[PDB]
Symmetry: C5
């Protein structure tokens, strides 16, 4: 669409708010594993080699489409996302040093606190007028993944369909390994990144701090607004009067006392997005 | 309501100042545990599983309401424009002779104590009404002690989820909402500022986790925090009250005899500048 | 001589590409294809007890992109700005890395050590190949030779006698090259040359050590401006744009002997160009 | 005071420069302990419990009053506008041959010493009256030695709480207030700048704690600190006195024989620029 | 000199570029120790106590005077306005096969070497005359070796304090002053830029200490450092000389056999832009 003038006058703006709950692999507070909702299943070093890596061991992106007030119901209009407030909620919970099943931080014979949540932090949020474009990669192209119908997750080679001999290409950049973030708890973080070659109609912001013992470093405020306008002053334009929000917030890992295996911990993300009416020509 | 013009002229502005003392769990310098005022009770890895987690083992938010000069006695409200805030007693964190603290030296050494280090949780807020809180749990089935009168409130006190439903609290339970309306009552480990409310508050928060992290803190009187939003409107004080809230966990001390920890908190100063703002009811 | 910016329709263009990492195993083909995007294993005495191999030496990526052919006024493409991203940062959360050391005590079943340690990140956009300056940490390191050569070393150009090679631990002005070949110039021997690169813009950071947490951001909301203090960006000779990159994201540690491999990630570039009038 | 116009003309500005030497506890290069000037006395975990903690084990604030050119000879005050401040001798922190310092190597080794590292407390202040101080105790019942005359003042020297009320000092005791009116006298561990006062002072402070943390310090003559408030008004010098205050704990050394520590401080330079301000 | 107008005209500016090679102590790629050019000699904890500390064990400041085009053949001086500067060879710091370096693995492993890490000291200066230095000692009674002719100069070489007064040098001795007037002669561990002088120089310094700290270094040709003071005046080049100074310790290597260290330095590049300035004498 050709983008024309910002529409002025009353009822020219609106605001939408929502939460994305974390999809760390145990994605429902129902069923056998409900006690660990908001965490991954336990991961051991030879998972994906000695056995098939399960979807419940692979933190995934969160996403939602929000229905906007129907436009075009004079001038053809679309909702334009201009700015958002986003917040990781429950950061205070990460002070706990009495984590159930967690390794004790003390010498043998001590009675110390648990190790708290620490280690790799992966934080991303996106706002767009259509689903977020993803690019696939593998750290280990020959990782063994559990297979189900219906699929619980999608892997880059499910799309790229390289033969065993060509799958090492996935440790680099395989142009065919592309997808849209159209399903919540379905695309693993460890295999999918936002695609900087697309996303012309989305904005995304991410940080990663790696390692297993690194201090989680997180801020929270309602005083900071993220501007979603591009260099021409145009924000994401909401196709079908739909706003698409995407998130991933791995806040670290817990370490299990009995075998020192880990689980990822995620927190919910809040979004408040401000939108204005923009005139367009088809 | 509808905000109109900033009121100008003589006595159109005012300033308030106060201290919030830390509520790390031992919240009074009186009684059995008064020696540990400004610290938590000792915490061990199985507390809340093998026993009931005590209110005194849970660092809590500080809060106060400050009465302003009464207005309307043009409708007018006090509008908080800016504040100076400061953590006081940072230099006390240099101590390497902490009472009962683990020695930082090999066996047979005479080294210093481990100083205060590890997880830092710093938050201040200024608002025209109590700060909105959202409940969470790191572990939904943590066992909590029940004191008389009750010393803390927990998210499930409000959500009233059945034991099979409580794992919802590891995510976002919308019913688990409260207002920061009592000093030393809302635990930091279960309550966060609610970003879905707080339209009339400003909050600023930082967390650095782990047990060994260096506390990293600045102090100055040369920095002003602006409380105005994108429209140039600050918090509007309902009932001619200003609400201030804080949490400042500065780290942990480690006990020599069993390597259990206590949180350490420091007091926070606030100076808030306000101006009269015309409003339409 | 640089004249006015060209105005009007079709006065600008955009080009997009990916540079794949060249950490030493530079092809997903042959005996070592399973470690594409990683280096060969490195041990402390490699380059002393044996010849250091090209596959053990992370290298710069580069490509030349053909622009729309230009040519009233003579015209060059001028690189104004770019968006660049490291892609696949999410893959660095893996704690089940094949052959990696276990992060737990003997008798544990803990996760693998994740990728961590030294990060070397550089990107460059230029109207001609990036100028490089040669150095050696250890001037007498032994390097393997092949024909065709898999890498070029500063002394291949400087041609110092063995007694003079210690000069390469400082600054040897003759040890200069141009980044004209992808997966050829080792990071550990070649730096962007600050005495040239008049027609190139480069940006780099290094955080060293073997245990350091990788610290990486990714966004599409940040533009890097390529204009100099006079408002002139890279001017594209032969209607070619030259992009260069190095992204060492850290190392993996082998369970067997605690030897390491470097890990690199691909880098995306989008470069916005405008027509600049020039004279001669 | 009601503040009026800046006074312009010749002789309307002046510049003050001086050094504050560190007061880490060994506050003089004379006497039995002179070898450790610029360090604290050694500190053990049980000091203040098993024995009385000494003034020489407690880093203290540095301060000076500087007399300015007298005004209202026969209403004007000096206004501090800006300052350049520098920690001098930062290069000395590279030493890995510190006297009596723990060796950084395994038993059997001949490694370097541990260098200065761990908790860094850096503060400077410029004001037109003494810096206001608020008292606190990390441990309210710490036992302090009493010298004659007194070498330090403690918060309860002013608050005078009974031993049963002293745990109040682990929070905020409003009675525990003092002015930084004496060099090498106010312990950093018990006194902080009082943010409820200091309306006529500007202070700047950074702390990074722990025993293992790297010192992180900058030095330049290219940065000016502005002392003006939101109204463009700097500190106004009461009685034509400028007050400068500092604390620069750069880290600790570890003793080889018992692993006890001494704090190490460095001297701080100030250049303050002042102008005449009319006042009612 | 009273400073007047910037001189405009076609031949009113010039640009100089040069390298300063590192003086970590082994200061020439010739002689017995040429193999360790760009490093210090090995350093042990008791050096300067059980023995005389050698000049080759003490990182030193680099410096050069560049001859500018002669002016005054009305009265004029070269004014340094801005520079680009760069640490060259940062990529070399990825090496984990350092000759003679400690293995980063358990006994019986075959791990990589420990790479260059630990203390980073980075300083550059541009002046119209030699940089002013202030002397200090971490340990006033360190024993310095005394070569003929001297290979370094020590603060007490200028302050001439008796042994009983030398502890003054752990603070600030006003007499301990020098000018950075010789390449590889002034140890970093004893000499800092003098902030009480250097009215006609600009210096920029950073230090990160410890033995295990990751080097943290950037490189670009997109960053220009402005040398103009508050008044818009850059350094004025006395006798038509430009004075550049540097120190770039990038970390230490750790020896396998006894875990003694060597410092490692890298070369620094300078491009300085100068303009003609009128002055009055
Ligand atoms: Mg490919
Ligand atoms: Mg595109
Ligand atoms: Mg829910
Ligand atoms: Mg809301
Ligand atoms: Mg040379
Ligand atoms: Mg040049
Ligand atoms: Mg009190
Ligand atoms: Mg006050
Ligand atoms: Mg002196
Ligand atoms: Mg001076």
């Amino acid at each position: 669409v050709e983008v024309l003038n910002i529409i002025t006058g009353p009822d020219s703006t609106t605001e939408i708010e929502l939460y994305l709950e974390p999809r760390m692999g145990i994605n429902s507070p129902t069923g056998d594993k409900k006690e660990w909702y908001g965490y991954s299943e336990v991961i051991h070093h030879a998972d994906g080699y000695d056995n098939n890596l399960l979807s419940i061991q692979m933190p995934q992106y969160s996403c939602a489409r929000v229905q906007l007030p129907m436009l075009n119901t004079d001038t053809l209009m679309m909702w334009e996302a201009v700015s958002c407030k986003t917040e990781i909620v429950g950061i205070g919970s990460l002070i706990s040093v009495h984590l159930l099943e967690a390794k004790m931080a003390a010498k043998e014979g001590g009675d110390g606190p648990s190790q708290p949540i620490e280690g790799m932090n992966y934080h991303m949020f996106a706002v767009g007028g259509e689903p977020l474009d993803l690019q696939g990669i593998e750290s280990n192209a020959l990782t063994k993944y559990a297979s189900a119908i219906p699929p619980k997750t999608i892997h880059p080679n499910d799309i790229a369909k390289l033969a065993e001999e060509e799958k090492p290409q996935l440790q680099g950049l395989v142009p065919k390994a592309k997808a849209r973030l159209d399903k919540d708890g379905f695309y693993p973080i460890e295999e999918w990144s936002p695609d900087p070659s697309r996303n012309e109609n989305s904005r995304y912001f991410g940080s990663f701090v790696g390692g297993l013992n690194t201090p989680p470093n997180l801020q929270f405020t309602n005083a900071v607004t993220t501007v979603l306008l591009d260099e021409n002053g145009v924000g994401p334009l909401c196709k079908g009067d739909g706003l698409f929000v995407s998130a991933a917030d791995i806040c670290g890992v817990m370490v299990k006392a009995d075998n020192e295996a880990i689980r990822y911990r995620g927190l919910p993300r809040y979004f408040k997005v401000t939108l204005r009416k923009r005139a367009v020509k088809n």
